[PDB]
Amino acid sequence: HRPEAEKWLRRFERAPDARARLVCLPHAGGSASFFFPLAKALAPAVEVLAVQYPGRQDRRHEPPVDSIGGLTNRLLEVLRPFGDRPLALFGHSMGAIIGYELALRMPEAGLPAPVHLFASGRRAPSRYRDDDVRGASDERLVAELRKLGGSDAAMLADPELLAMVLPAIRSDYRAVETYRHEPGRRVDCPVTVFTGDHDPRVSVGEARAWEEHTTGPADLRVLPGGHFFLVDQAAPMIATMTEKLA
Ligand SMILES: [Cl-]
């Protein structure tokens, strides 16, 4: 079971004396490797556990888990062994939703409550939007990922890997857009929200609205950029996260 569980997590920089572990949950089309710089930046005080969803990179042959709830169910089991220190969650876009669902479910699932939720690039769970005004073409979604460079973009360049990963991007996209929150629910931990100032799917009001999803303090940081603002704006985010986790 642990060997299977370990397929879901990558520890790019062991931090045996970390005061907290930070579970990092990528966007649609994003893999664990997205958080390699963050693991290096937060160690030794915080240990990053970067989540590898089925269908990603080394898991490319596994069918995507097709719903937020299915991902959450599986991740709850993955995170069982980390109750010896505080656990915090960070997610971008789809990852933000999975982070929120994990935080809500953890106590009834038998896991200690998380100490903090960082929600990046995502409107509050209660905030509804109809279909993207831009549509969601294969070309746009792949182009956004290509722009980021790194390992995920390198994969997309190979037409054989592209053919396999495109349906995973599509599955992820559909999972997030079909996701519906359970009305009335609130986590108990602090929520710190990061959003780009021109992400067309996250208004400042929708980002502030994360306050309706916690009984604890909610914080909002608007950073310059679009949906993937967090790449170019990594430093102040890391600074804020370090401060919050200290
Ligand atoms: Cl996403």
UniProtKB/TrEMBL annotation:
SMART domains annotated for this entry? PKS_TE
State if Hydrolase is listed as a keyword: yes
Domain annotation Thioesterase TesA-like: ranges: 23-245
Q: Does the keyword Ligase apply?
A: no
What top-level branch of life does the organism fall under?
Bacteria
Key words, A-Z: Hydrolase
Q: Which GO terms describe its molecular function?
A: hydrolase activity
Instruction: Provide the GO biological process annotations.
Output: lipid biosynthetic process
Instruction: Please give the family membership noted in the entry.
Output: Belongs to the thioesterase family.
Output this protein's name: RifR
Q: Which organism is it from?
A: Amycolatopsis mediterranei
